[PDB]
Amino acid sequence: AAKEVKFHDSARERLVAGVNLLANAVKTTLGPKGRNVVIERSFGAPIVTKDGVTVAKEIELKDKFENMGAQMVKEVASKTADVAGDGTTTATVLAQAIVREGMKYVAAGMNPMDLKRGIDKAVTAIVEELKAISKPCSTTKEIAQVGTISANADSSIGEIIAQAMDKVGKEGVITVEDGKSLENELEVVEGMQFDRGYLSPYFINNPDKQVAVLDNPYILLHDKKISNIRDLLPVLEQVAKAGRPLLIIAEDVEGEALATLVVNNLRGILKTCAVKAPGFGDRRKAMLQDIAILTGGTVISEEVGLSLEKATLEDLGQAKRVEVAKEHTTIIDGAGDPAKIQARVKEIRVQIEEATSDYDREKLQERVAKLAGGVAVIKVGAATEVEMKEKKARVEDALHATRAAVEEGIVPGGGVALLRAREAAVAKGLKGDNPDQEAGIKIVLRAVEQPLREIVANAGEEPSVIVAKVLEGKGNYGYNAATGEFGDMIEMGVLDPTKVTRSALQNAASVAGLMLTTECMIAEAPKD
Amino acid sequence: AAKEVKFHDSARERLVAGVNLLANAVKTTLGPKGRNVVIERSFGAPIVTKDGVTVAKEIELKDKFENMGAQMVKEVASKTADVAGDGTTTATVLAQAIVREGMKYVAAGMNPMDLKRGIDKAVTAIVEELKAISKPCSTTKEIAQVGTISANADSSIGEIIAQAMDKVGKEGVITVEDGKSLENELEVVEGMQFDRGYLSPYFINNPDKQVAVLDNPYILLHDKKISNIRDLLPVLEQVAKAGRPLLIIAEDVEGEALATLVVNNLRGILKTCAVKAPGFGDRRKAMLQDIAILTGGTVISEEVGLSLEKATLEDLGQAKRVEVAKEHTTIIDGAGDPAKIQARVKEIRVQIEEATSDYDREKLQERVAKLAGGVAVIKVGAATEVEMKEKKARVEDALHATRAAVEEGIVPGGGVALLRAREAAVAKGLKGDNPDQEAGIKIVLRAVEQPLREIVANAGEEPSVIVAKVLEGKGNYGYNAATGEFGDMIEMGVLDPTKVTRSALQNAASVAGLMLTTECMIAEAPKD
Amino acid sequence: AAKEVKFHDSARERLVAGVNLLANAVKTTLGPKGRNVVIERSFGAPIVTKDGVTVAKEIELKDKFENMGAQMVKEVASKTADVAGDGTTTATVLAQAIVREGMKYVAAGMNPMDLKRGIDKAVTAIVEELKAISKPCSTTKEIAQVGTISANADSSIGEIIAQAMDKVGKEGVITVEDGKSLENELEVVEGMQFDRGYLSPYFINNPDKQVAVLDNPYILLHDKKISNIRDLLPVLEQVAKAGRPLLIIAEDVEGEALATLVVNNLRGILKTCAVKAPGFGDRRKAMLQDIAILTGGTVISEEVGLSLEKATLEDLGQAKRVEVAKEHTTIIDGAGDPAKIQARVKEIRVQIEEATSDYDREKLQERVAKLAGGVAVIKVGAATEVEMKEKKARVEDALHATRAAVEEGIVPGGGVALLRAREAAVAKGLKGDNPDQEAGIKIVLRAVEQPLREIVANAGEEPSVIVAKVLEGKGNYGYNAATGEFGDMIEMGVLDPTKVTRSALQNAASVAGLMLTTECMIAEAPKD
Ligand SMILES: Nc1ncnc2c1ncn2[C@@H]1O[C@H](COP(=O)(O)OP(=O)(O)O)[C@@H](O)[C@H]1O
Ligand SMILES: Nc1ncnc2c1ncn2[C@@H]1O[C@H](COP(=O)(O)OP(=O)(O)O)[C@@H](O)[C@H]1O
Ligand SMILES: Nc1ncnc2c1ncn2[C@@H]1O[C@H](COP(=O)(O)OP(=O)(O)O)[C@@H](O)[C@H]1O
Ligand SMILES: [Mg+2]
Ligand SMILES: [Mg+2]
Ligand SMILES: [Mg+2]
């Protein structure tokens, strides 16, 4: 429809007002002494959150020109959440600091394109200094400290995450679900479990658990439905001769085939259990192949030339124990050759880099976890689901930060890392080509102080005095906003993932630099 | 509905007001010191653009009479983007200058139709002088300079585009897509790649990369589905005793045929791979014939008289090497006669001259690139999506300008080319048939100074002083707005494609000349 | 009532908007090619003026915050008109230039109080250089040129004013009144005339022109009413045997005294005339004393000790000729000694410095003109009243400028004087204490170019090109906007009073400097 066009300061003033409104709301949640933000939901039960990205995504302004500024800052938080899962409040605070400091130079008449080029030059220098300052996260104590800090000083969340990563290793998958009790509990699933139950209660061999337990069983992988007994009889006779139990993993076992199994179970002639093949579509085939590789067998399929009638014991997978519950079954550990298992894991991890869908690599990682790792479930305990949603966001934030810690390392928290990186970059000789680029560098140098300033401001102290004292110190020296005292940030456990710090600065600079270079602003005009 | 009618000056002022509003918004982005324009999107994430056509297309005015002026100037940039892909801001600036200068003569009682005839006469003379001033773009250094200027003084974009054109040649195709890293990367695909993967993972011969490499294989081109085995056996036997691998390019290979190929792969009897035929509809037939010509084979089809059962080794295509990945295969080098390949390329380029849809020659050029060239992919690296879109537009603009540079040549940039062409045209005796036509010539003579004036105005200097100094100079002498220094434009790297300059002037003159001849305007009346 | 308070840039943008609105209206009248402004009057007959002060005084804005800015610029023009009577448009233009240039430095974060201090420092230096450039106005040709320029290139007005100043000298008084003809006419009144007619038509001695001429008469000065014949008889008898006529200057001659004079005139016994004493209150006494000093007589008053009954011939004033018309009488030349006349003139000129009212010094100058000079009346000729008012304002401007020219000298016009003074001041080492004061100096250096820029802009040429050419010249070299050519401005007759140029700059700097220091604006809130 009709468009309203704003120029020069009338457009920048509207843009900055939208930037400030969104960032001020996100500001309140920053730091250990940051406070919660309540966001109304259409379906009732307002959410309480301390996450910057959650607050940013819910902000829309009636003024369309102000809304444009808010939408661009919302991009900073959204990108930081996507790439790091943490630091969205820090990224939003940094973006507002760059805009606030950059608009002073834009009003001073300097070329904003050179300011943006100077901003990029300074951010590149500071990010390189962050890499040098960063230290690897090797000890599980550091993992707990990183998780504790990112969970808003919750030691229980940090400890349970450190235990989860210890149990499932680096290749494991950790998820967060609602708990039933009031306390956090960690459930670790070892081996391969594909969450499929038996097709008949008569497969159960012990009533105290209602779980079909098979000791040293054969595993039959089939990619087609099984209904008649004629084709399944030849393999049944072989496993009957051996005496070992048989686990039939196929799309479905019904009619004569299912009936025959339950008869042999009741009379004790042959113990067996049947489960549905996990997953739908091609994912069902992929996990079926993984089970065959893990169990040392081959999936029987006419697409590969194998037939159920001609299937032999060598084509069947093996294990020492599998237990089938009402809705899940776990192969404790397959009998396949570990070299082939490692090769299969290598193939998936190579293909992981090519994954595009967000659910794609998530489902590919659980396959790797099922193969050569474990799956940990952290069940969050809370009295009410409004507290459960708040705690789950904190647990998920701590999981993202701890994952980023093992990837790129850790740096001192409380905004100290940006200050230390800034001083190193300046000492190295950071400079611009023209005075406008030098001003752009000075924008970033002042802006990196903002995360510490807003942390201190939320704590109720004077940001300028604290920042000056921190700059006087060297190394990991910093300010603990939780206790209001200075000290070695690493010793007091205030740790930040360097990936989160680097991502927050890079995302903030890219968007805030563009917002400095705006002269005209076009939005749809109001409906009178 | 009801129409409101405006006459004489009352109509012209409304028309000019719409011209000025659109052109002023586009003005802000002109030159190296031009600034960005933010346009709000309905779905959030406002776009930040420096392109004139992008800004112009989003401008609509509440006043319907002012909207006509905006709509008519808007399509000056639309036509310039269509034919050159660059210079849309220059075209919009030129169109406003002609309207502004022409309205003075219309208000002076001069015949606007003779003004339009004089404008056309002057533009024809200036365009001819642009051809004489233009110099061919031979060196790759000039290509980098042209790309750097069009990417808003970004040497990385200019250098990567120059490398891309060097690798793929004049007949190659270069595309721009999003990157995953923060840096621009160039991926060059040589030979023929048709972005289709294998039909079965068992075709993989090396698990390190999950790829299927066939060395000196036969290629079977089939335009019909393959499902049974009795037809594929005669050609499979012929492939078998030769020892070379076989690549089957058909619509689909399922059932018995797929199983037989998979079975022989595991047993090692005969190594082969099967891929789906690329393309849909008649386009699938076209590239299948191209593959047959490239590989020195014939597509087996009952529509031509060939049969799969009667297919022989001579009918099969050959290549030195082909690799089949999960989603694409690349024929490294076909065995076809280069004379036939050149003839095939000649036929397609003839069809290119006749293509009527935008995707028609685009796919036709892709076929030519697959045959006798290469496909280069520039992955733009940016931290956020908003910066990614802005960078991609700059890379696309630089690609269009470099293509225009090799097509028609280069001229000194910064509005110098129009000034030099104007002086040459005046010195050649440019005159009209009557004083009204002479005024139309004087409109264009003043208008061509506007691109330099607006570049200098955005740079903050005095346009009239700079223009006078530039006119005092000769040849490539000009003003560098980036550095604020006078000098040789070609030596300083400020290069412009002569096609972009010619297209901008011709499109601006055609529309702005018509706008001078308007005496009555008719629009739908407002709803009270 | 309730007050609305604005801060920072919101307050400044409203202040500047009011400044620009008033100055843009005044801009249109600047220079030889400036155009008229029509102002609505409540009682009909709109005034057409080219005066900056007249246009500025009529401008009031609905926005109270914008009105505050307009009221301060209106103050610049009012002060310039008060002290110089010309240069009000130049002062308004200079004030806007300082505000426009100074707002850029205020927006750059510089201290505006130091900007004001730098502005004052630069203006002091430039005014000093204006004194050196200024040359005295000693020739009547220069007076005509100064009057011609200030009358908007009207040679007739300049010539008639030059003639008027020649006739009445430097001590004379020139006034402007409406004329009955279509051409300007100059009426010079020599000697003492106090615009008082005879008391009876029988005093007329020649009916051709209805005037009463007395040759070598005695003058009787009386400060009290004369009604009875008894007191007037002793003096009347004394002048009877002398044979000379008698002029009686008293407040009133009525009753027996008036009748006796009429009877003696009719019978020819004693020729006489009687007039009212000019002026009211103490001004009547002062002018009566001046007449006595001029005529060499004494004022017969009981307040000094003299009595009408004891009045003698030596106490009576004398003159060689006096003529009494219906409403005025002129003493051709008094018989008093020049030494006492000059002493009386010196006393009044000393009192002139002490005058506290505008009419106070105006009437004092009239007394001095009556004593030792002349009174010239310029009757402006015009066809209509609207043209008469426009012409009268131009004549008053030329009168004010010519008076300023003889006081302080003349400088090259067209804004050249400010440019030459700026170059001399910079070459002399004009500098500030701190960089903020240096910026304040740079404000004035750019601002003094504005009068030439707006003169050229009204002429339709390019201001920046002309200014550069003028600056590259030296001395009186400048641009003639009337003829559009460069040359010696003194030779071409474009002259300006250095008092007008100095007053315009000083008044503009004082107000515009304060406007830069604005942070908060308090105005009455709208009444809703
Ligand atoms: N006890 C503490 N003392 C000082 N700083 C702390 C402390 N705990 C956390 N921080 C800092 O606060 C930041 C976490 O605030 P948070 O609201 O999580 O921001 P974000 O979600 O953007 O990471 C971290 O950068 C960390 O350095
Ligand atoms: N450093 C420079 N100095 C002077 N002129 C330049 C410089 N860089 C680019 N230009 C000029 O600016 C113009 C580029 O305008 P641009 O903002 O890209 O819009 P468009 O591409 O629509 O013309 C070109 O004509 C070029 O000649
Ligand atoms: N022929 C001319 N060429 C150039 N400048 C001129 C000419 N005539 C007048 N001027 C300049 O124009 C100014 C007069 O403009 P005017 O509207 O009278 O302004 P103001 O009333 O404020 O003095 C003078 O300063 C004079 O120097
Ligand atoms: Mg956090
Ligand atoms: Mg361009
Ligand atoms: Mg004047």
mmCIF file of N, CA and C and ligand atoms in Angstrom, chain B residues 29-32 50-52 86-91 149-150 397 412-415 455 479-483 489 494-496 500, ligand 2:
data_model
loop_
_atom_site.group_PDB
_atom_site.id
_atom_site.type_symbol
_atom_site.label_atom_id
_atom_site.label_comp_id
_atom_site.label_asym_id
_atom_site.label_seq_id
_atom_site.Cartn_x
_atom_site.Cartn_y
_atom_site.Cartn_z
ATOM 1 N N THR B 29 21.573 6.571 -1.904
ATOM 2 C CA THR B 29 22.412 5.395 -2.080
ATOM 3 C C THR B 29 23.452 5.553 -3.179
ATOM 4 N N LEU B 30 23.549 6.723 -3.799
ATOM 5 C CA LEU B 30 24.410 6.887 -4.960
ATOM 6 C C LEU B 30 25.848 7.172 -4.551
ATOM 7 N N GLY B 31 26.782 6.486 -5.199
ATOM 8 C CA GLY B 31 28.187 6.765 -5.036
ATOM 9 C C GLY B 31 28.840 5.959 -3.936
ATOM 10 N N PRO B 32 30.167 6.059 -3.835
ATOM 11 C CA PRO B 32 30.876 5.341 -2.766
ATOM 12 C C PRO B 32 30.477 5.789 -1.376
ATOM 13 N N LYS B 50 21.395 -0.880 -0.813
ATOM 14 C CA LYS B 50 21.978 0.276 -1.475
ATOM 15 C C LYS B 50 21.631 0.318 -2.956
ATOM 16 N N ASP B 51 20.766 -0.581 -3.418
ATOM 17 C CA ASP B 51 20.392 -0.658 -4.822
ATOM 18 C C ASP B 51 19.248 0.304 -5.107
ATOM 19 N N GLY B 52 19.359 1.043 -6.209
ATOM 20 C CA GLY B 52 18.308 1.978 -6.567
ATOM 21 C C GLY B 52 17.012 1.290 -6.953
ATOM 22 N N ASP B 86 22.730 -2.943 -13.255
ATOM 23 C CA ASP B 86 23.471 -1.960 -12.485
ATOM 24 C C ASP B 86 23.148 -0.587 -13.052
ATOM 25 N N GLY B 87 23.473 0.446 -12.285
ATOM 26 C CA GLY B 87 23.177 1.796 -12.715
ATOM 27 C C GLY B 87 21.740 2.219 -12.544
ATOM 28 N N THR B 88 20.966 1.509 -11.723
ATOM 29 C CA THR B 88 19.574 1.885 -11.508
ATOM 30 C C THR B 88 19.467 3.196 -10.738
ATOM 31 N N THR B 89 20.372 3.426 -9.785
ATOM 32 C CA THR B 89 20.401 4.709 -9.093
ATOM 33 C C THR B 89 20.788 5.836 -10.040
ATOM 34 N N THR B 90 21.769 5.591 -10.910
ATOM 35 C CA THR B 90 22.168 6.601 -11.883
ATOM 36 C C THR B 90 21.031 6.916 -12.845
ATOM 37 N N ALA B 91 20.309 5.890 -13.294
ATOM 38 C CA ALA B 91 19.177 6.117 -14.185
ATOM 39 C C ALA B 91 18.091 6.934 -13.502
ATOM 40 N N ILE B 149 34.312 -1.671 -7.782
ATOM 41 C CA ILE B 149 33.545 -0.430 -7.783
ATOM 42 C C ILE B 149 32.059 -0.720 -7.616
ATOM 43 N N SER B 150 31.554 -1.725 -8.325
ATOM 44 C CA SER B 150 30.134 -2.040 -8.269
ATOM 45 C C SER B 150 29.727 -2.711 -6.967
ATOM 46 N N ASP B 397 25.210 -7.339 -7.997
ATOM 47 C CA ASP B 397 25.432 -6.120 -8.765
ATOM 48 C C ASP B 397 26.812 -6.118 -9.408
ATOM 49 N N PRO B 412 35.428 5.684 -17.901
ATOM 50 C CA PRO B 412 35.746 6.288 -16.603
ATOM 51 C C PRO B 412 34.491 6.474 -15.763
ATOM 52 N N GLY B 413 34.618 6.191 -14.469
ATOM 53 C CA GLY B 413 33.492 6.211 -13.563
ATOM 54 C C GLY B 413 33.278 7.568 -12.924
ATOM 55 N N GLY B 414 32.361 7.593 -11.963
ATOM 56 C CA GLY B 414 32.047 8.816 -11.254
ATOM 57 C C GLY B 414 31.395 9.882 -12.100
ATOM 58 N N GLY B 415 30.551 9.492 -13.051
ATOM 59 C CA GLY B 415 29.889 10.446 -13.912
ATOM 60 C C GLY B 415 30.781 11.124 -14.924
ATOM 61 N N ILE B 455 26.807 12.206 -6.621
ATOM 62 C CA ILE B 455 27.915 11.478 -6.009
ATOM 63 C C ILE B 455 28.717 12.408 -5.111
ATOM 64 N N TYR B 479 37.043 12.903 -10.504
ATOM 65 C CA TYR B 479 37.068 13.132 -9.065
ATOM 66 C C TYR B 479 36.765 11.825 -8.350
ATOM 67 N N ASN B 480 37.666 11.413 -7.464
ATOM 68 C CA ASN B 480 37.462 10.218 -6.654
ATOM 69 C C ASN B 480 36.727 10.616 -5.382
ATOM 70 N N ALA B 481 35.445 10.266 -5.295
ATOM 71 C CA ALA B 481 34.662 10.634 -4.123
ATOM 72 C C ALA B 481 35.079 9.854 -2.886
ATOM 73 N N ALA B 482 35.648 8.659 -3.065
ATOM 74 C CA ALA B 482 36.105 7.881 -1.919
ATOM 75 C C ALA B 482 37.255 8.574 -1.201
ATOM 76 N N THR B 483 38.205 9.123 -1.955
ATOM 77 C CA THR B 483 39.374 9.768 -1.377
ATOM 78 C C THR B 483 39.324 11.287 -1.451
ATOM 79 N N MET B 489 40.793 8.575 -13.690
ATOM 80 C CA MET B 489 39.796 7.638 -13.182
ATOM 81 C C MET B 489 40.210 6.195 -13.435
ATOM 82 N N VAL B 494 38.463 3.684 -10.679
ATOM 83 C CA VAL B 494 37.042 3.997 -10.763
ATOM 84 C C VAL B 494 36.563 3.730 -12.181
ATOM 85 N N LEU B 495 36.066 2.522 -12.417
ATOM 86 C CA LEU B 495 35.670 2.068 -13.739
ATOM 87 C C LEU B 495 34.171 1.817 -13.773
ATOM 88 N N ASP B 496 33.563 2.106 -14.916
ATOM 89 C CA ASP B 496 32.151 1.846 -15.125
ATOM 90 C C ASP B 496 31.953 1.103 -16.434
ATOM 91 N N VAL B 500 26.219 -0.080 -18.885
ATOM 92 C CA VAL B 500 25.427 0.427 -17.768
ATOM 93 C C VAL B 500 25.175 1.920 -17.934
HETATM 94 N N1 LIG D 2 35.572 5.997 -5.575
HETATM 95 C C1 LIG D 2 34.713 6.578 -6.442
HETATM 96 N N2 LIG D 2 34.909 7.839 -6.876
HETATM 97 C C2 LIG D 2 34.066 8.431 -7.737
HETATM 98 N N3 LIG D 2 32.973 7.834 -8.236
HETATM 99 C C3 LIG D 2 32.659 6.569 -7.886
HETATM 100 C C4 LIG D 2 33.529 5.853 -6.948
HETATM 101 N N4 LIG D 2 32.989 4.635 -6.775
HETATM 102 C C5 LIG D 2 31.869 4.577 -7.535
HETATM 103 N N5 LIG D 2 31.674 5.731 -8.193
HETATM 104 C C6 LIG D 2 30.561 6.028 -9.121
HETATM 105 O O1 LIG D 2 29.312 5.831 -8.465
HETATM 106 C C7 LIG D 2 28.397 5.151 -9.319
HETATM 107 C C8 LIG D 2 27.839 3.962 -8.566
HETATM 108 O O2 LIG D 2 26.523 4.240 -8.121
HETATM 109 P P1 LIG D 2 25.794 3.143 -7.215
HETATM 110 O O3 LIG D 2 25.607 3.706 -5.833
HETATM 111 O O4 LIG D 2 26.540 1.852 -7.425
HETATM 112 O O5 LIG D 2 24.357 3.042 -7.926
HETATM 113 P P2 LIG D 2 24.174 2.478 -9.419
HETATM 114 O O6 LIG D 2 24.978 1.206 -9.466
HETATM 115 O O7 LIG D 2 22.690 2.260 -9.528
HETATM 116 O O8 LIG D 2 24.712 3.575 -10.298
HETATM 117 C C9 LIG D 2 29.166 4.678 -10.535
HETATM 118 O O9 LIG D 2 28.679 5.349 -11.698
HETATM 119 C C10 LIG D 2 30.603 5.073 -10.298
HETATM 120 O O10 LIG D 2 31.113 5.724 -11.460
#
